[PDB]
Amino acid sequence: KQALLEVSNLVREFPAGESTIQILKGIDLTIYEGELVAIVGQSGSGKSTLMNILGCLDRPTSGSYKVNGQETGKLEPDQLAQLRREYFGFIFQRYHLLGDLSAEGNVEVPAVYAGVTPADRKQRATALLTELGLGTKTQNRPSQLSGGQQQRVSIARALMNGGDVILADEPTGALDSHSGVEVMRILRELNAAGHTIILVTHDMQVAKNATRIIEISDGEIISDRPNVPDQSLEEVKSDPDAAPAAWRSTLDRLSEAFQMALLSMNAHRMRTFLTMLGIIIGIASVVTVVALGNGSQQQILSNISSLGTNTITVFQGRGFGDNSKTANFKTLVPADADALMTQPYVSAVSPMVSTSKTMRYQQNEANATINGVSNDYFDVKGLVFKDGQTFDQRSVRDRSQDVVIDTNTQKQFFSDGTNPIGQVVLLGSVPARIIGIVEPQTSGMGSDDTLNVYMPYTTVMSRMLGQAHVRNIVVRINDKYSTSAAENAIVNLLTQRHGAQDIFTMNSDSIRQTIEKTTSTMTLLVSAIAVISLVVGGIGVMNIMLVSVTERTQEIGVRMAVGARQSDILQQFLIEAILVCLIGGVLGVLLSLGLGQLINKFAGGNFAVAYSTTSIVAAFVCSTLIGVVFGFLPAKNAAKLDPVAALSRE
Amino acid sequence: KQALLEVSNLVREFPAGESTIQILKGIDLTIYEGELVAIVGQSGSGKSTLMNILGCLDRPTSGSYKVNGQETGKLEPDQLAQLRREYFGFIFQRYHLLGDLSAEGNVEVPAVYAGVTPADRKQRATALLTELGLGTKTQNRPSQLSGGQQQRVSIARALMNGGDVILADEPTGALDSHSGVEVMRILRELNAAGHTIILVTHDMQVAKNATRIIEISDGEIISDRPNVPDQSLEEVKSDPDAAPAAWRSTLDRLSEAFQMALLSMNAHRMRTFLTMLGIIIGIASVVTVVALGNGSQQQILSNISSLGTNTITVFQGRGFGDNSKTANFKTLVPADADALMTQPYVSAVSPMVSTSKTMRYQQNEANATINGVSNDYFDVKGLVFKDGQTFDQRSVRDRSQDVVIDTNTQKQFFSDGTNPIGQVVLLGSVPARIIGIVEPQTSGMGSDDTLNVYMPYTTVMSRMLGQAHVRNIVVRINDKYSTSAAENAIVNLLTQRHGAQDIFTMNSDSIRQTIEKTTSTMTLLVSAIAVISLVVGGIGVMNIMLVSVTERTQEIGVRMAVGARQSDILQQFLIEAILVCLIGGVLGVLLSLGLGQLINKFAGGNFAVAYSTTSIVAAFVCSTLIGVVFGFLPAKNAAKLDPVAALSRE
């Protein structure tokens, strides 16, 4: 028949100085189930390398080691991990425990990396910890336990997956005489229950506890020989301790990884909040700058929407410097607008003049801008009437005091819901009857904020201003038929009619396009100086995750020796980085929101901030990608660690 | 007389569960110089607490401990540090060494904090390491040494400041039988030389190496008693080992802190380059943005530097057409300039007209801008003549073909060094003789470009263009009067002289002023989106330093135990952060430079980058301040650690 542990011709060469050295010189050994073995030797003998190979933490590399008939010489890390989970459990001199978890958690870890019900492993965990006398200390964390207590914890952990072969590296080397007697007694009782126990030690008095003492020096076994410890008379073995034993599952273990990362974040908070804080600052700056640019383009377009579509406007210079030069040198007259009206390219034309007067309705008064306009004006500027009607050509000609108001004026005087149409307000000293209401241009506030009122320009000029000239003339170019050449033919036409070239011309579509270009581009470059430099300046996640790997290299080694797959470590650290970046992106979004509603307070009427709902989705996605990226290299470096070198590193 | 170590009724309490517990009950001890003492007890007895107090790492809270007649009960941390450096040296179970330093360095550390010459301490370090058999291993790092070898290193370290009282925790607890005999024999040999040695242990077989065995349980000494070890005959001495005992020094401690921070940086490289890298990106982005803005303001001012200082320009005209229906409406005539000349506010006036023609000198062809101007023109635009003279009022009147050239045209045709004055080139079909050379408006060597040439405006209008009108008229404002009132009187004046308001005017000083305002504030905002978001988003230095304090807590404890002052730890980590920020702030400056010389290629004439030499100084200063700010909190957290808790944390 075949023994459990079958060692044939193990040669382990570790290279040193462009040459190889044999730490194991061709050892043959056979250990059957249930046997109590102490491998004893001095430092450099090869005892601990031999144990590493026995524990499937290392390969022969020349020879054969068969665990229950399975050769490990060619096996790959996850296969050796399988053998660890099924057959082996470990105990170390300094009794490595996870400072984050508790006793029950440390005990659970091996069950976690195997397939286990989270309820069931709580049952076995608390059960084993109770058998070993820690029942009251179940919830204690390693910093809260003594040396002996921690070593008993790691015993329970080794027994979680059944402890078929328990490998103890100098288990009493760290702790005192009493807890040493207890650890040794617990092991001997476990062997009495049938556990194969192999303890490696440099102390002969320690090796006395075994029934079989193998002695190793300079990579060869010099002695192996039966032994009966004398304390078997001391301990009659009264109180019995017997405790022997790609679709689907990656969901389950990935969930486990989520709680591993989550509780590890909860353990270390301050560092989570700082690394996360960089990303909060980053996403906040990104969304703040992008949304500020979007809202400022939107604002300055709706603020300049006072022009309209396909509208060429015609101005004058000053012509002042005296009040005689007013009636002299102001040459733009409504006759010019009438002339423009008969042109083939003009769909609509209006003159315009304005004055500020006190608008009174009943007891309420206010200050309003009164705009003398043609009845065509609402067509050219593109205003749509909420309720009423415009004037007529008849009413423009007859100097009607019919008046049109905008939504803001309705809000001012008629807040009662009383229909303003038909109501007679007074503008200055001139009464007016409201024939219509207009919904204005702007999206948000803007600069208006101002009460607009429209009367026929004839009535404003004659009844109010007392002037023969027009402030400016707006035209809607029909068909968009040579929209630029219309402006040119307009200046040619009025320059003929005037004595000289008296008139400035302003193209609305070109002004809008220029504003959109400049705002869009500068929002792009400023937002790049935010995004690229900041979020890319959030590499610190990578750095802190690298230092988190170097920190936990022992934790990683213990995880692997307890049966962690490389995939399991990688998923743990990727899920940690991903989760930190995701949550810190959510807080970056919220900081950007509240910060933006703060920036709406500031005096800029040109500055507004508009949050694109597809820049928020892009924010979450990009933050999570920062997690998956930086973010990656440490999560892979951890899973690629050598569990031997990882376990012994300090 | 009084013995070295005098303990009288020391009671050491710790709070447990909202109540106090006595770990040390009233203990009396007297240890004279030269005694070999083993304090032996089990875990919880109070033995290691008693040692901590003996080592001046902790205070009794009840009672007295006098080191050579000096009560430590009320002493402050730097005072206890003094006593450590003067009297004590330490040895720990796991033989704590600094993985960064070598054997010689670890041995030096106590001498380092004791104010010793690096030459002298190198001698004593190598001497002690040779005495203990490490002479060949002198340069090895702890990772390169065996357990016994490392413990021998820490022995030499304890002997550095003289090892009057050597306090050993379990010295053999980590290491095997042979190296145990070696370490323990070395101790007995040191006591033979007169070293007071106190070794605390949980193992009686270890305690028997001492001549005096004190035994302690539940905070009291149950036994104290002489002992003669049997190994005194087994150890015969063939090699007696006897090695017993203003403005200045703060600069020394800063030098040491600089050296060790530097070597620690050299130890961990990837961490350093990543931590820096954020600040390299940050400083690069700030200096790039500010220098881009300064250079773009520099260009957009030099692009509008085609105007003068205190220079009002007068334009007109848009549409094409006939000689009748267009040229009749061109009202700018040199007569307008003559009228302006007699005004009190006008220092100089020139009209201006331009045409592009092919300039030929000998075999060279080129294309030049030909500017009809008044002889006053160089006065108003502020051009200075490199060599020759301007025209005369007679030559302007007489349609002279005398011509003035700028530096660029000289560079083109006369690159032979041939004096251009007197030479006859031809402009188009019109020959001209050069009477003068002008140094242009350029700020920088990329602004100027095109070849300017100036003839009297009369000659250009009549001989070339065939037009009666002037493209525009430039006016320099005398008295340095109000340029706005100048515009007002100019527009009134030419508006009266013309039929109507025919003329547009540009104020040069106001345009320049506006460009400077908007560019400056704009770049301040964008550079704030760099700095505020980036360098402040470079908190990660603080985080890495903070976890670097965590990882080094044992290193910090050992340093304090060898005599480190809190100030010394503070200087170490604060100087580390400072150097991390400064180095890489310089690399951020260099990255910004190279990026700027990249942007000088790929960018147009509006984008240029000009690096202010007072923005680089500000870069170094600000980076170092980021060090002194963010690095501080960790550097303080390290210096405030309890050496007891720091040593036993893991």
Residue numbers in the entry:
A (entry chain B), B (entry chain A): 3 to 247, 260 to 664
Q: What did the study's authors say about this model?
A:
The envelope of Gram-negative pathogens, such as Acinetobacter baumannii and Pseudomonas aeruginosa, contains unique tripartite machineries that export noxious compounds from the cell. MacA-MacB-TolC contains similar components as the relatively well-characterized tripartite RND transporters AcrA-AcrB-TolC in E. coli and MexA-MexB-OprM in P. aeruginosa. However, the ABC protein MacB is unrelated to AcrB and MexB, which form large trimeric complexes in the plasma membrane, raising questions about the structure and domain organization of MacB in the tripartite efflux pump. Here, we present the crystal structure of MacB, and show that, by analogy to RND transporters, the MacB homodimer contains two large periplasmic domains (PLDs) that enable the interactions with the other components in this tripartite efflux pump.
MacB was purified and its crystal structure was solved at 3.4-Å resolution. A non-critical polypeptide segment between position 248 and 259 at the exterior of the NBD was found to be disordered. Two MacB monomers have a biological twofold rotation axis at the centre of the dimer. Each monomer in the dimer has essentially an identical structure (~1.1-Å RMSD in Cα position), and has elongated TMs (TM1 and TM2) protruding about 25 Å at the periplasmic side of the phospholipid bilayer. The interface between the monomers in the MacB dimer is extensive (2188.9 Å2) with major contributions from the TMDs (1053.0 Å2, 48%), PLDs (676.1 Å2, 31%) and NBDs (417.0 Å2, 19%). The TMD of MacB encompasses four TMs per monomer, which is the smallest number among currently characterized ABC exporters. The TMs are not swapped between the half-transporters and lack the helical extensions into intracellular domains as found in most type-I ABC exporters. Even though the MacB monomer has only one cytoplasmic loop, MacB preserves two CHs as observed in other ABC exporters. CH1 is present in the intracellular loop between TM2 and TM3, whereas CH2 is located in the carboxy terminus of MacB. Unlike Sav1866 and MsbA, in which CH1 contacts the NBDs of respective monomers and CH2 interacts with the NBD of the opposite monomer exclusively, the two CHs in MacB only contact one NBD within the same monomer.
